[model samples]
Target chain A: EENIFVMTKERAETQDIRALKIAILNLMPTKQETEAQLLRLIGNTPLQLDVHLLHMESSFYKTFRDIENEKFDGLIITGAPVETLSFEEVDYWEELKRIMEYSKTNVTSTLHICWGAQAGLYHHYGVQKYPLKEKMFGVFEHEVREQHVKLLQGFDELFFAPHSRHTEVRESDIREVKELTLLANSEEAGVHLVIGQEGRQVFALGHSEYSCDTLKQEYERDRDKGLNIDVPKNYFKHDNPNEKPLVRWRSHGNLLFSNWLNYYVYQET
Target chain B: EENIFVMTKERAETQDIRALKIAILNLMPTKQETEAQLLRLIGNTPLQLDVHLLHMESSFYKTFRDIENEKFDGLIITGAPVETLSFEEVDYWEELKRIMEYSKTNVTSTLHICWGAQAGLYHHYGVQKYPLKEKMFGVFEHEVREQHVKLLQGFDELFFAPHSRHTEVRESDIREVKELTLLANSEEAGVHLVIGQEGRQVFALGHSEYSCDTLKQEYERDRDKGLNIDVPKNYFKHDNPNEKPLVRWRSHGNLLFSNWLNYYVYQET
Candidate 1:
């Protein structure tokens, strides 16, 4: 009887709820950079979150060599930038699928972002992501469909979110799924965010973690490559490309991340 | 160990830290209604909060006897409309003084509003709240001091706050004290809000929690009572009383409450 742990609701409400351990599956090439971005947003809250990065062995692999030595109470899986191709065609598909399966039993909650969200949808259910003819790049206007959901709590009717992808999961496919709960979504953007297994698995379809200049930087990078990049919608003063874009989406971003950490992740620890 | 809660640094980053608990010492006559207003503001955050309401047990006394069954980590002391008299002369002075002292040790963070603030300033420090020959009642204009402070974090340089008081606390008196820190103030209305002990004791001379029409309602009420009350500064559209009072201070109000709760209260908890 020296060591005992029981998964009880009342016990969680009282003690050791201050500290939370979370793992981030870093599928992006610049692992450390993503770490800083994710950490900066997560760290802004009062909730003490310790983050760990996880990588799929198949693509740009990083072993559990270091993280295995640490303690993580939650896991956050990041999306790879590669979203044009089918799930199986992605370089990290196999190992990431394994990671998704592993998260269900190993962690209290797993938050998947962008491509990671597509992968989670594909793996958990049979939903598939389809590439658009043009990339859905820039900060777009999204209205909250469900205000009562804890996931999108405190968000205004219309909010801006950064979306940079050439693909989107079909809304029809999501409706066909049985296990998932479509919490807060946008009619124009399809699904802004969702959760599964009563919030254990969360899918963020956009870069809600983007800083004030994140979309601007992305547009500049792509345009500099001589790619056909359009100015981000609902950005800049009066949608003028030359005008400085306001950090309009930041409050919503803070709300989204803080909600995940506060409601979904923090409650577990 | 049957349940070995293990996580890596990357994984743990997604989890939230502990929630800040804030207490409000409500000296306002409408006890439950004030609780509703403050709770609506604080509870809107993604962060977890356990709210406590402390009242002056002696003045306008109506004790349910069962209210204090639960303890709170944070406290907020609200301003009473009866600020025309001196502190020692107030009916609830003894009870309020006792609660103020009780807050010093029991509550991690306390926000004193208006009369409560006046009582707290006088009791905690030697700062006195003096009655003005003219009532300082109305939606007044205020400017924020840019020097860094936790409670006023992420606010614009100048903000509008709703003020409806017959008394005002001078900045000169506040500067006379050493333990106090002035966070934000008004040139016309004097000190709007201040924070002490990194937000352990917060005081707001203005009603940031006041609704959009709060000032208008107060003005109309006074007008009906035949009380000679002047119009609030920076309220209405260009001082037009017929126009709807602009909701300019709400953003700062949210910021102030969130700062006190997230950075001060929750951090302490």
Candidate 2:
């Protein structure tokens, strides 16, 4: 069959399909590693994207001032290690809030991951994040709550996502916020995926972008530090600490990002 | 971020993106049902497609002669209920053979499902199929054999697929065929996916496009016909016949079809 063409160079030129401009706010300490992880998930789709990776502390670097006036098709706010501290107590809380506020008006879709999710929920609504008794550190099973949501489009009724956090925004807190809709959740991991402002904002309380060995590296680090961290749940082969982490979340992780681009960020032509 | 734009009409018109012309050879008894299943899987992608459905027994109805001269971007050959019969013994074998032969130089990519997969493998590489003692029915767990295969791009390490067949092609048979690479397989379901000619030809042993209720419908129909068929395994909720079928395969199912379209059928611009 000869009909399906991805657009030849000549053909693409005649058409007006321009590459997408997307920005990511990387709050993780491992900036390059997290960039690679997020990039791997988003790179598989057919869409052409001009992605800009930006780190915060917006001053001598490309500050929020440089981006405040510009419009972005999509913005991704990554999980920060500042989950243990109060939202106000975080060193860059005011700056982060400003960017989040700008994201509401300027970005077509904003995807907030893990700690970013808790912060977005807290900032947008009055939802508060609380400390977990024990770290919610593992790959946990999640179930889709709303089947019709475009972001969760093509998602399995039951799926998996990685959660490594010291704090969580509770279901009851999110439920009280009329603007936020809970889409997918885990029995063990508490709140999973939530949506607000139609599909404009997505909050994910797990590290779907974590590489295969991310939890392993964290696991070993915490153990050596005498924090007594057990192996990530349902992660290692037969849950063995010495075994390789099972990569069950990559498929849905890819689906989640691609669906967001296709549905939430890039609307129909 | 405001830059990610799905081509607006004005932008789309200036751009040379065109709808793909795809054809499906519906060999199943339930043509409408099978078409819907395949359509639903393909519909979620960002690409535009013009799908045409054709049934064999090509005489008064548009025959193979009409399609022999026309080329398609992709062609899908669905599993028929004629697996019990010899390929040569089937009434439409000659027609199918000529069509398959035409597909070699005409179609960009061809997808063969279940019985069609057996036919494609047998015809292309002389891999023989054998009868099973009992039907290999129901949803089964599968593992990715080659993680790097583009057809299986973004696939999880482990996944589930639905199989409903009384005959199978063995691993040894396919392994010996150098042109054919076993991309993904299941411990219980044997070979799951095979790729040939650099994904120009894909042979899927399981019905990845089957609707959630497809196996259930088949299970009930056979029981009413007095066949001693048990409920499909790993299909119903908690394996209960009375409960609704759990949809674990939709995410990967969508991934499988979309990946084929993206990587196999449509090459880069």
Candidate 3:
């Protein structure tokens, strides 16, 4: 007979598990799609996440003051379709500015995506965005510039991510900011990932949250609307629109969100 | 003044953090390499893990009685090079059997990798292993058979993992048992991931723990030893051994360990 002691009853359950409070400031026009995308990334973590959706009021007199007093473990500011407009020209620009300011001290970590990334760069670091001659739209290959950063852990030497934007943030402009560290970039995509204030804030230039067919959907939508749109580069199998787009970016996308949740939000405070 | 709520004193830390106690029954020839690989995957998770390395004692009179009284949240049994040998022919076979039997009721979850997976299948469900005329050594593409499994959550439609073995487990044999659920598999690599009793037991037929240079090292070592070993296929750039191998499987590997830790061990009572 094995001399294994069955003293499992002696072990008391003292673990007080709490769901991480995470707030998402959805800036995308298709709110439901963005919500699903962001949720899919963050929801995969073992730790329970109590997610909250935040909205910017059309005017400055009223804000999301209801939950402003509450604390959040993490905040995610998703991409908006207003990259063509000036920051000051956007209607909810002032409201977003206030929330961005709030995230610095209040939130454990804030992840800004796409145009939200551009907005964060401008607001937080005074970095400027430049209009691209081409759309800079497609799935591009990015190389890990800083492997030691916790956010980029488990990342391959070269990984793929989807990008859809007309404006671009130059690696040169990002380097000008002393406090910021560029973690990942591509020759085609310019700057892919940036970290500010030791990952208290993270900015992603690509739509890492985009599903496999997202670029395809965007391309078809633009083409149907009589907008001049090239087939999203390096997306479809053999670059053919009739073929299904391969999901090369998802593994890295999942890792990015999981690492951020683990290293930044869950580990800190 | 931007109505900023300084949370200096307001934030009270009430979260009870406990490092998960995990035991590793390492049966590999190069123990250190296996340790580094397994540690790299499990360490990436946000939760702290107290990893314990267990050795199989040759002498029957004296076993690892010291740890018998203690309970582990998780156990990992790594692949060994003794796949060609019969179970009884292996020196540590008796000890491994005892440990496997103990894991069923003692540990919350047990993860078996590669040859360890073969051993577990044989022991737990009476599944038989067949020898291959050639080695299945390469990075192979796999598709997720089941999406709802917690271990495969956030996994891509198609994923990649490395394999190096002279033995194969047929899907027909695995399907014969009603308790087994094949989570993922590859056309080239055959069986990839299998789960039993929900996630109480997980068996992986590939070395997801293998780093970028592992297969390369194996290839070079075999060639130096004058052994007729082919270069790992779909690994090095353009199938050239001189070029660097791409780390395509790392993200899934990291996620696999994290999911097992979170869903199987951490969440289990």
Candidate 4:
């Protein structure tokens, strides 16, 4: 009887070996919110993910000086709202290049989210994003490839993602590049997610991790700012602006980040 | 320069620190295929999950005794085809009971899959299951509850799961018991997934880990055996058995398991 309690006590006391050391390069305009989003998603996994929030020194406002002082096992770069400027002319171009180069050697896997995806692609592979006459906003359909890659495991043949972007990388461009493989894509959405450099680097064109209200909030904010935004296509009940939108992309978002951490990031290491 | 690579090389090597170790008490008669099924789902996460397979020593048959020596951070008790027998009458009931009790302290989190869920409720919560005259072998719809719990994170308001059982835990019986919360439930499916002892114990009444072809194969097998099995509801295209079923449940399965690992097993540990 005493042994039973002791055993239970020991079991309760036992914890996982250690947390996964993950770092986030916060380049999004809403740095704090982005950090919270990444942290919440990473924190929610079955692995112990210890997050280290970082910033680029290249930016006039956000610098990598203090952020680069620490090293991380896995790194993520958030997309910036700015897309018009070329990668070379961006305020922190040199610093961004240095950080991108540093990540190859220093980080196990580097995830580029949204603008971060475009930035890394431009820098590493000359993959450039072109401005769209219409934005690929709202939830878009995607299908998993036939190959049994761990990164796309548990994903559906048809999946939905929350996207809000005026710029996209053409499917032809993604196909022409040898390094890139399309995990999930759609006729309507250019490329939902792509991975390169043997899963060491991942580029997600859509906001799979967007909170249920993320697009709603973005749409409202843009509308208030006088920017004409369509009701995120494939979102809400019949795209009703007033009705509470169905959180369709959340499962795929969880799958994307979790897959990135388990298969793409942590597994390789 | 070489020293830089060496310094950072060790950083990526420590990605295993983020690994969530899961042990499956493979009580199912078809152990190999079962192992493949569970691993196929949990293995795809971004975290490195080291899986340990186990079985009941007290009721050892074709399985090896050495398998019981393994330890894990989380435990998943899979459903057996032995639902025809009562829990006490089952071969591994005593050993599974011990494992379940041991999990309270030894394991970070425990997942009860399908009949495993039924057994878990019976063993842990004293929740009872009744034999249905007709087996509920079909895909069913569920409404995800909006709660800030770990196992059900990244789920939408309604999700789908594949269930094939002749037994179910009465919803009233579960509700009567204390601390058992139905995170996602359905009228046709009853309670699809439940959380107990706060978030530490998770139960999936349906097969979230089943492959796209799993339900289809089961239905065909039963039909061959001349067993009265209904067409899996909402599973096939227009109930056409010949048609390839749409991959609907994979999204929720990923979310459910990933959240279990991230929030329950990984974060708490």
Candidate 5:
């Protein structure tokens, strides 16, 4: 009995080395870039994150069984290029709906990004996405609408996040849903962040995952393709494209992901 | 054997509730306020931090034996109000020197803040502090001088931290020390952060732990005392003292403390 008691005490004293099982559904065409970006944010936490990548195939995710059967501490759904297309017209809309539904019961928390945010809002809360006259492309300023939420802990009164979207979900639609709490928003970026089911679901309207040069690369890509595009707003130093883009949104991005991991995923599990 | 193995496995699966023993030498006069500020920053981490506050009385800290006999995962030395006094003129300078020497072996990491930063520099690298023409006051911009340091992992190219000091540590003196790596600084705020012995010792020349009203309170107190003081620079909205100061540095402050805890203290042990 003494030996058993001593062993238990010894076990309690050592740091636990359990890795959080987080599954990422890579919906973006630039799969590797998204993987690196998400990993960088997730990697900043002290917890060991075992990231599982889910690929899409045949209008459904390749690893549906694993995701459904294995409970995940966290789930991340990346944005897709099909923002301009109607929800029903998108080939993977049904499959995406099923995965999100599974997340409600099987995952501790789900972080939905960009187009994923729009889709999750539409599916869960009857919110609609409206097309914008121009792409909401730039690093825009946002204000924390609610401060008491654990997710916004240590956040500034004013923060910045990168937004590059051809469509937006309005505050009117989100505010109508009594279950959803708008955590933050920008005058220019419409809905920035929203939480539902007491942080089981978090929706981000922009790309906080984008690196400093991501917007610049996107602008140059469009410009090179003979497509109409303007320089990304409030990005380059002195509004000069030749100048390097100043990284103004990184600290908030790091805080957002770290808070989500710490408060939602780590705390819940 | 089977029962022992199962018990060990069970302990590992649960979030390791092993609280880190962190010792803080409270050198600041407003002891309770400093405790609250440090606690707020340190509390944001996922790790269970058991903070022990050490009172300094006379020549030595009261709990010096606790630090010397027992191993601490982290140590924090707060800024004192004795900046103008010569090192030997301070009553506890000899005791502090001994405590700092003991920290090199007994503590995993020591975070020196403000005057503590200046003192740590003097002790560790023979770096001298010079009296400023005027107090370095306000929320000032600082850039990450080194990009790859683990303590600055998620920081932006530019960040802000609050400074309120009558003495300054020169960049030229810090640059001359081969063992010290200047991590971040501001053009206006001078040298801000330095790492030594590969993060075994961290010196922060600003009050990242200060709450939004700390500088304002200091400013008002000095003004009431008939001491020449200017309103804290770049702090208030519209630069008005009556207006509440905007919290521009909280996120990075959170990140800095979190990183120090993760990379320096937790990881090292």
Candidate 6:
């Protein structure tokens, strides 16, 4: 209950309805960071959530075996460090495929993030991922393409979200797919968010769940290890790494998650 | 009933909880426009709302005689077209004061917008509004001062909102009061949003409920009447009057109203 905030105490006490059950499939290496990042967005809404974490193997979350028989209102499949690996070459590719395939029948809505997004697009549709010449890194301006899309219900005409990936799902492949509707995209970052099967499956190519310091930490971790990494573009003021990350996406970040929960998951449940 | 969006279907059938009762005092001349603007923000949330429209005298909305005994979870007092007139010179000044006083006992939380904010600050906190040299018009950039405040729960560090008033409540006066906390402000727009007596009373000096074309229409109305009005600043693309108004405030505009409905009203109720 650490993450669930009751909007009205009186209503909470009075209501006989159950909280919307949400499951998180955390593939990111840093467990606590992803938890905090995702929870901050999820917990700010008026709805109460009964959250369950799922991972490859952890005492904190149940494994696939424990919840394969169950159904959920919502599911979040997070980015993994395995983007460089071929989808078939991933150690847990088969298991990940099982969860995604199950999403069609068992989960009301499934949100796939970054590597999860790239992998989901490939898995669900016949879309392919291309290796970008450079990492599509840092904050970039994005515009809402399909303005009336429910998943982007309250989004501004223009917004910013941080990108930190070496690979991307191209617009050509996404457009060719009949089920995929490209909701929003950035000029430099390419296609960012796309919805498939009427918002039940959402694919976000950027880290909308990332905290302000996430990119900063990623840059610092590589820099200290003597790796050749450029500073994230349009992140810090004047693109200076020393300056604090100017957070512009946190608003839409919350909006995107909450909208997913509200329209796609909560509405159906 | 028209505005309430049920986030869940089966839960809506199962739940015994009552909807939050919200009243909107429509002081704007174009009643339906204000209704749509405010309802867009309020209805987007997960919570169900039973909205009541109140006005001076109308068959559409009940007058003061209809629901004086009723207690509301939230109330919104909108901006009027009487900002240029002195408090005493305004025709309904006395009646407006009575409703504001009634809000303290009858409403759980009250939001005062633009001229409503100016009037509320003067009546309750004794903060004086000074006439500006020119209209503090168009979309202005605002920064979060009290970042962790619940009203701005998921707000960006910097956001934009529209302002269209010829008078403003000064920062010096707002800061001087111990009961008031300035939540957000703009360098160009001055004090934008302030909270009084914790979160029960909120004063917004900008038009956060404005739609994309609201400012554009306002500009044309003044210009057509041969009034000397400068084209609204930072509104259009490249600040050109002929261009479409670059909408940047819609996201935060929705965020502000929904946050108010969630934190101040829903949480308290």
| Candidate No. with top TM-score | 2
Candidate achieving higher DockQ, 2 or 5: 2
lDDT of 6 by residue, A132-197 (tens): 777778988898888678898878888889899988888988999889999989988989999999
What's the number of clashes in each of the models? 35, 20, 0, 21, 0, 0
**DockQ ranking of the models:** 2, 5, 6, 3, 4, 1
Deviation from native of the Cα of residue A80 in model 6, angstroms: 1.4
Q: Per-prediction TM-score of chain B?
A: 0.84, 0.91, 0.91, 0.87, 0.92, 0.91
Write candidate 4's Cα lDDT for B192-234 as tens digits: 8888987678998888788788889889999999987888887
In model 4 chain A, the worst 10-residue window by lDDT is: A5-14
At residue A50, candidate 5 shows an lDDT of 67
DockQ of 6: 0.22
DockQ for every prediction shown? 0.10, 0.30, 0.19, 0.16, 0.27, 0.22
Q: List model 2 lDDT by residue over A140-162, tens digit each.
A: 88999986888887888888899
Q: Is candidate 2 or 6 superior in lDDT?
A: 6
Candidate 4 stretches with Cα past 4 Å from truth are A1-24, A42-75, A84-109, A126-128, A153-158, A233-245, A251-255, A258-269, B1-135, B153-158, B166-180, B195-203, B209-212, B226-269
lDDT by residue for model 5 (A94-185), tens: 88888989999999999999999889989988889999999889998888898688899878888888999889999988988999999999
Q: Which residue pairs come into collision in candidate 5?
A: none
DockQ of 5: 0.27
Sorted by lDDT (best first), the order is 5, 6, 3, 2, 4, 1
TM-score of 2: 0.87
Candidate 1 lDDT tens digits, B1-269? 23334322332221355545455556676666676678767754455554434455562222223234434457777878677777788887776766667677767788888777887788888888777888776655566664567676655445567777878889999987778888778777899887776677888888888866778877888889998887777676787889966555665677788777766766522
